[PDB]
Amino acid sequence: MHEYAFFLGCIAPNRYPGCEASAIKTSEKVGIKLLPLKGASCCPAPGAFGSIDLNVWYAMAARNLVLAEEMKKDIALICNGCYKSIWEVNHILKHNDELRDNVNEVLAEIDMQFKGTIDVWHLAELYYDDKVCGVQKIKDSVTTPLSGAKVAAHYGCHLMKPKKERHFGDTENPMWFEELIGALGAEPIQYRNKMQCCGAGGGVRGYDIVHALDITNEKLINIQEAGADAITELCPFCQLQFDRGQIEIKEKFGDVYNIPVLHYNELLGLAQGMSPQDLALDLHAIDCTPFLQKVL
């Protein structure tokens, strides 16, 4: 049973707690142990806080990293934006000496040092790796087939891009996340421009809601045209956009889709037999009941 510190950023615990609950339960069912991070905070959200000040972005991400450093554990994440912040600041401060120095003399005011000893993983990346739980182990753990459901994957942008800074391979047409959805028994479908941004990154969600919603609506149109019955995602930002933004699209525009948006951990819980009440699917703006009728 591999053990990881569970970073747990802002949106999953405070808006979609079923995501974190299913994360812990399903990760324990497969051979992974997710340990609470002691006093972790907002990973300085890369858009809304990196746009303001890169130095304080570095300092806060480094503080989050040195918490798990003192814990002597590897970070595990469930958010693409949190992955950007944590993993990328870890990678930058493992190689840039003057930035290490600057962050360290900022952190020395709170009796705290960064040395760069741990690694950062996304939970879906762990589920895909073969040393850690693999696709076959996921298939083994699945107990409810979830058959006869068309499911559209949204990769997001901060997990895989830029490919010159990550290690997940092709960004033009990846299929790895489609294999994790196929392990659950749901057939993943392909839609036009599947690698498009959801529109919520960089603080655009806050600065220009209509612009962000138009970017989201382009995706929703493509997904409905494909014929999806739900949208899996690996990011609480993207889930919030696809969930709230459907309501804001219904009100600001006149478009109705009613497409449930679920984190992959929530689908994994549904596959492994967790209850909808135990997943808190009532906390989503868009009702999941048609999808539950199909897969149950």
Binding site: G39, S41, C157, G202
Partner: protein, 189 residues
């Protein structure tokens, strides 16, 4: 464009549209290069970045134009552009640039300079306030505490919502860079 008339609407209408060598700020370019950590001066304006941007088809935002402004040193043209905050940082431009430039990193550096000159949307400042107060950009509320309890999780996550002693360290980090002292001042107006 003959000269300054001091009639504001006519100055706006007949603003000199012609680039002069007095318009270049090499200091601005050097600050951008340092902060962005990218080779931005090596752009040759192929248009791949704009061709990949998801914000371009629905707005006047042109990342290639911002790269050109960076190269030419057009400070007060880049920083005051309201389409500096339409980048979602999706990194498609960086993914595809043939010169290994990070235009989105150039955008991030430009946004930092805009904040230092006090141009910044209010959501950013409100997020600064929230993170200062609780350490969380999206904090917990009563209804989510009730939902977590009904799930079976503790009413608060293991974060600084349940360990408020780390909030003081976060606040010292923010105060060292004076982020709160600038955000509140800008919000006051």
């Amino acid at each position: 464009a003959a000269k300054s008339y001091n009639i504001p609407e006519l100055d706006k209408k007949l603003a000199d549209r012609r680039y002069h060598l007095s318009d270049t700020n090499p200091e601005f370019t050097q600050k951008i290069l340092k902060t962005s950590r990218t080779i931005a001066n090596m752009c040759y304006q192929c248009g791949t970045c704009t061709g990949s941007c998801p914000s371009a088809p629905r707005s006047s935002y042109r990342i290639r134009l911002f790269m050109r402004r960076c190269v030419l040193g057009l400070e007060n043209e880049a920083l005051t552009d309201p389409d500096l905050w339409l980048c979602t940082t999706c990194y498609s431009c960086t993914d595809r640039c043939p010169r290994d430039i990070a235009p989105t990193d150039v955008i991030m550096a430009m946004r930092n300079l805009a904040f230092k000159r006090d141009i910044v949307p209010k959501n950013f400042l409100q997020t600064v306030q929230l993170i200062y107060n609780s350490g969380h950009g999206v904090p917990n509320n009563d209804v989510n505490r009730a939902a977590r309890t009904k799930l079976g999780l503790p009413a608060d996550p293991p974060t600084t919502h349940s360990y408020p002693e780390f909030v003081k360290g976060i606040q010292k980090i923010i105060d060292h860079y004076e982020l709160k002292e600038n955000a509140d001042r800008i919000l006051k107006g």
